[PDB]
Design a protein around this ligand. Structure first.
Ligand code: P61
Ligand code: P61
Ligand code: P61
Ligand code: P61
Ligand code: K
Ligand code: K
Ligand code: K
Ligand code: K
Lengths: 456, 456, 456, 456
């Protein structure tokens, strides 16, 4: 089916409600026109992020009651370890409270100052942690991933020619590692093909370069592989996931996405020495190698969640619900990044706000207008998030200037998607009304989280 | 709005799945062609009943962690007591584990053998408990309630002429009480108007006759009053509910319906003497006057749920979701009871299976076929449920021969409704294939729950 | 150990507090000097009963999150069914909301008016249900069970000579069944030996008489067999429990005791015909044969709890904690029923209040005084509970006139036991102050639950 | 009362068990004789730490069901924020996943390389983050805090003459801040007096020096003030806590101690500019200013638990339960740190193992032997934990060479304390059997967490 019914039913609910437009106007201004700064109770449908906002199952809530809260050697850590070893096939695991805790560890463990890290498109926390440890980030994603309107499969693939050029020009020894993300968040939640994963393994292995996956949305990625990559139509999601990670030396994971939890992450690796070093560092920032800044009950819920995520009907519906929202938006001519990704519809604010230049922050302003007009919260994924160039002080200027309608797993229905689409479509009819913004307060890094703006 | 989005979002889920038709064929025969005898894991979408199958809120689950499990005087009982006193306006409450526990008490308390009980249509457990205690049930519902296809408002209303006729012919002193149900389940979930409740109160009070409400779906009932009775458009659901019970001497309640819980009921009354007698009897069958066969945590969840149920947007959506299913079926030509009621769509098995006689049990067989062809469980509400005449031994033979597609509160989506409608519409295309049934095992009372059948 | 440390640790808590003496004085008066009528919030340590007041484990609370709330065929019911079949060895089980629900079913199913039911001492709800159905209760417990101060093992044993006498004088066909309770609650929590169950099975079998156990505290009973009956020292609690029920035709169970839950019970039987008849009747009073008036989650919690109860260290500590309280009392010369039973210490009010006659209700008044002086709630288990002779209207006058300090499973500590002991011992120093009571309001049955009194 | 009964009762339990000595011997060797490396399942009574191991209340578990899991502006964050503002009286709060996350933030925010941080005794993570950010740690605790056997009140107090000397010799501008911990963990859980907090506040404010409290066991600290400092006997615990922090510029807090939770922490400050900088940094390591690496439900549980901690009878019993264990050990002549502190009894391993030198790691070995002989886990708090001098590479070699029997809040009973005491006293009788240890694996920082040893 184009659009399957939910492969689950509702066990428990939380209410939603909408404050009137006059009040939303005030709230948007109080938040300095940054949706990050709005309060949860003032939001009707919260599409800021699919991170940590997921609905857990009855089985996970059973796990929540069985936390072994020991400071060291918790049974829940061992359940998590066994599960990740079985499903991902990595030798070793260090839990972290969430994904950027794992990025902090990886970056300190695997980067020498002066080295290059090459990735399939930047990510905000990921790039900050690479740069603060002395690395230069090099984008090796295929060109197509920066082309918003282009409807092509596997937009997240690395261009092997860009990888080869980095190697030839800078030398393999000067490359800390390749960061391969599945899916690619800022490209629109775009998947990477198994073919590309295998090809990257082969090239890097030949030159002795390590490859660490960002595994955060690896199950959405696995779904696209099953759906679209020839040869995989009859493989299980679990088989796909396991093969994906066989092409990697380790991974960072925010469990707050595809592990279907509200908190949690981990760092994996095959190398014994790196594992030892990781454990020496985890106690500095996170907690013991057997809790990593998580309560025992959360290691448990994460272990259970990862295994649930492998169910075909669950992930098919997950992805197709997002696709449904995108299809409704397209049917009305609303410009979006194509194809629709695993976790979100990305409005293309470059097209939506043609009357604004990127320097007046059209994505940031569009996200504010969406809230004011509909009570829906969405996220800036453009020039603000991209941050400043750490050598020149200028904005990084991504080609993609987008607003992310991000869907938490198992929280909303198609009726909620219809409400979102209807509201965005009405706003599009008067898109010329959206005004440019300027900074009135800009943090020194990861500025999108807490920046404040005013209208031009 | 015709069909509002859910005014809540999902906090936790439980998976659903479907076993193939060939296995369902076998399971249906193992169940003696009676949907009550099917196992839960063998059912894809379970519309057997809206009783006790509801999804609770996060707030209710918080109350589930706060059970004061004292054998007597639990703080949870006091919370329930004051909630019901506030919302229903009755003087006294006695908790029971569910509705038929309250029916057992009322019937033993209020019936002298040989007396009449008059109601707006029979109900199965209610009539059995009336008859077990020596009463003769008299149906005083308006004639239109028995006319499946007749689309009129407030089909649940008592015909005051029938009540008057009973008083005239039998004498007021020979009437134990009037049972006034809101809504009327077996009529299709049909509401009773405020005007009717008032007229019933006036006539009964003039003859000294007691009126006990069956409050089980009172909130659905209050919704229909708000929506359709002129003079009530601007009243809150809560003030409608309170006014309704101001015309009663007490009530039975299965909380497993409109109190949004999985177990729980109670008996209310204004009379001090009956309250005293009720407390003497509750300890025989249920438990103390302060737990009545419930865990403290369940009195808590029931108190919280009754109050949540008064939110307009919740109950508007609840009722319109049922209406949506009914609208799809009607549009495709599938025969249903009209108008659509508060809790369920009722297929008209008489019209659906015109090739069968009522003696061949078309509702029971239609329910079996629905399960075989779709994995949806539905309920017989026809000749089987109506039981036998306890004087003559003949089947009661109700005019309404129906299969009930019953919707748990806050559990399913419109997509689930679409799946259900598609399946029933497909079966309707070959309705001539539905075969008649005969009993192979018949229980001595309430026979629909566990009777077994074979095809004739 | 005489007194083992708890074989568990605390996963969660609820607070306790004590209102001052002058407030307790007022509350006791407002409660008509009946401890049943006190509110939970006004109680410091609530020892009214071990029924439904148990602390569940983390595993049970895990189970509480996994309720399959289906109206029929719940997976939780099948887990319960398979657990009871495995552990008790009965063919069939019918769930009930608690114990007296099962007694209602048994008594209606197995008693013809005019017949005798013989038991190892009466119990309150049990005897009422026997009588209501037209049986005469005959006490066949050994004489020693009525001798409060006698310290002998297996006081709950049936006297085979009394059973034989009944067979000889009334005929086997006039005995509905034998009701063998393990342990015997009103004898002081006294166990029955395996030797005795064997002998009763043999005598009843020879005469075609049925034996139904009251299984309510069968695990406490199994503990005494293991501790004290020759040949059982190396048998597991589970092995002992299974052998016990191999001597029975069925059982009633209140799960609210040894199944470690807050609500729940069941009826078991080996006979196919009785099982069919039980299922016809369960739907009248309780619910479906597959929920019996319980939420799915509670059948789950009860299935888990029954299996947990078989852990030797748990039930060892359970029983020895009670024994600890009894030993502290005996050390101070406070008169109690001997030996200490499985679930409670029974103060011997006959000796404690030797200045009052039984017609002045010493046990009722002692219970009132204990609350006033200490904030501890305890239960009348004497002339009040015994009720009225249904032929003569006089009080039944049990030899045992006792006040029960009943200990919920896994709730209190030895320090709590010490506080209770200190309070009772202090009261004992001035026991002469305890005043006689008289009825002010007397229910027609099970009078102890809600009766009100005043000082003579 | 010397030792009060628990001012709560048990709501739910988790089982404990003991593996036999021969298995414990093997597990201990497998853990390289480091108790941190043992598995929770292999531990009978786990006294490793009071961090994150607490039992929550029913009210907290209710709060666990009401997590608003929004990525930004969660209602649970606002509850935590207003709770801490009310109770601690700081202007601003930034949540962190636990204490060392708050220490990472404070140290990066408030230290310029080469500055001094002075504190009332070192702590492990605290000193590491100070040093890693370029500070030199200066111990300004009174000399008596380092004298295990010296029983004096308020041993945690800063020596004002050491602070004055630091200011005189280094200059106030070269002091990054003062770290004032309440209680002082490594001194034995020793309280700081209100008089000392005032004196430190006066001196630091005169030189424009900031004082940040380590708030981790501030409620235990408040208890000692109430119990022992003249002029506070009639004040509530909450009034005392609020006054304490009125002498501070901010705090770090691990909520995993006195906030009665299993995960959680925060950083407080009064200064607006520092709040802004902390928010710029929190997003790097932890998460948003409104979740800081915690699930919404954990911010809820922490807000609830901090408020519960202020209950006098709760904290009185908490501290007096520790005292009970300490009193038992002292009476048998087992050497301990005196007086007994808020959270633990510290065995004095220098005196316990007088036949060993500190170079042979007697605290580390004594902890290993306690586990082998008793199944009780305890913590090294001596030469291993103290780590190496970051200039010379020599062991810090603290005067206090101790093993900590650390008591989680609301988890164990006095009977568990008796079992622990019995086992320690028994081991003390053959204390000369305890063998010296040497490193076989030594981490580069915080080495006690994962170091492995072998017998000399
Ligand atoms: C592919 C990847 C992520 O998507 C990711 C997180 N994602 C978020 C949360 C967030 C992160 C960065 C932002 O600029 C942002 F505005 C929102 C999100 O909504 O997209 C992390 C970091 O994992 P943590 O969030 O568990 O630390 C690593 N890798
Ligand atoms: C208007 C009313 C009810 O609808 C009702 C129950 N209703 C059910 C459950 C059920 C009852 C009787 C059946 O023949 C049946 F097949 C199903 C239902 O599905 O409709 C009760 C009794 O409340 P209890 O179920 O809490 O005891 C009293 N009054
Ligand atoms: C050996 C047996 C029991 O002990 C028992 C109950 N016991 C209670 C509760 C109660 C019962 C009767 C009283 O007079 C009383 F004051 C208190 C108790 O505290 O002892 C039941 C009945 O099980 P239900 O309580 O689940 O219906 C059957 N059999
Ligand atoms: C006075 C203070 C603490 O006691 C403290 C922690 N205490 C622990 C856990 C632990 C910490 C350090 C160790 O060497 C250790 F072996 C155990 C403990 O058991 O004592 C923290 C840090 O708070 P976090 O643990 O929430 O990050 C800051 N300040
Ligand atoms: K249910
Ligand atoms: K209870
Ligand atoms: K923990
Ligand atoms: K979250």
């Amino acid at each position: 089916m184009n659009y399957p019914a939910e492969p689950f039913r509702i066990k428990s609910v939380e209410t939603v409600s909408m404050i009137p437009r006059d009040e939303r106007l005030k709230k948007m201004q109080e938040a300095g026109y940054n949706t990050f700064l709005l309060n949860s109770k003032d939001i009707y449908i919260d599409l800021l992020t699919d991170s940590g906002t997921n609905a857990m199952s009855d089985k996970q809530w059973a796990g929540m009651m069985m936390g072994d809260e020991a400071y060291a050697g918790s049974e829940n850590f061992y359940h998590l370890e066994r599960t990740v070893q079985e499903l991902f096939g990595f030798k070793h695991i260090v839990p972290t409270h969430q994904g950027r805790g794992a990025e902090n560890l990886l970056s300190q463990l695997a980067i020498k100052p002066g080295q290059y890290v090459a990735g399939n498109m930047y990510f905000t926390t990921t790039r900050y942690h690479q740069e603060k440890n002395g690395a230069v980030f090099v984008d090796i994603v295929r060109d197509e991933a920066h082309d918003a309107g282009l409807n092509i499969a596997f937009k997240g693939d690395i261009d092997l020619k860009k990888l080869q050029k980095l190697i030839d020009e800078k030398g393999a020894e000067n490359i800390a590692y390749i960061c391969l993300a599945v899916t690619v968040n800022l490209a629109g939640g775009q998947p990477v093909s198994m073919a590309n994963m295998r090809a990257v393994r082969e090239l890097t292995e030949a030159h002795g370069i390590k490859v660490f996956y960002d595994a955060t949305r690896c199950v959405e990625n696995a779904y696209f592989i099953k759906e679209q990559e020839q040869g995989f139509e009859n493989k299980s999601i679990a088989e796909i996931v396991h093969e994906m990670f066989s092409y990697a030396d380790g991974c960072t994971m925010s469990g707050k996405k595809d592990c279907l939890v509200n908190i949690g992450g981990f760092l994996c690796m095959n190398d014994d020495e790196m594992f030892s070093s990781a454990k020496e560092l985890v106690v500095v920032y996170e907690g013991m190698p057997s809790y990593g800044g998580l309560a025992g009950r959360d290691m448990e819920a994460m272990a259970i969640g990862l295994r649930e995520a492998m169910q075909y009907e669950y992930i098919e519906h997950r992805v197709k619900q997002v696709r449904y929202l995108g299809d409704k938006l397209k049917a009305a001519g609303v410009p979006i990044v194509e194809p629709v990704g695993g976790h979100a519809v990305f409005l293309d604010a470059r097209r939506f706000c043609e009357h604004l230049t990127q320097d007046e922050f059209p994505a940031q302003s569009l996200a504010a207008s969406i809230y004011v007009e509909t009570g829906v919260r969405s996220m800036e994924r453009g020039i603000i998030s991209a941050g400043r160039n750490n050598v020149t002080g200028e904005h990084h200027r991504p080609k993609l200037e987008t607003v992310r309608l991000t869907i938490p797993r198992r929280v909303y229905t198609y009726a909620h998607m219809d409400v979102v689409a209807d509201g965005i479509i009405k706003l599009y009819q008067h898109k010329e009304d959206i005004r440019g913004l300027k900074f009135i307060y800009e943090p020194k890094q990861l500025r999108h989280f807490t920046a404040r703006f005013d209208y031009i």
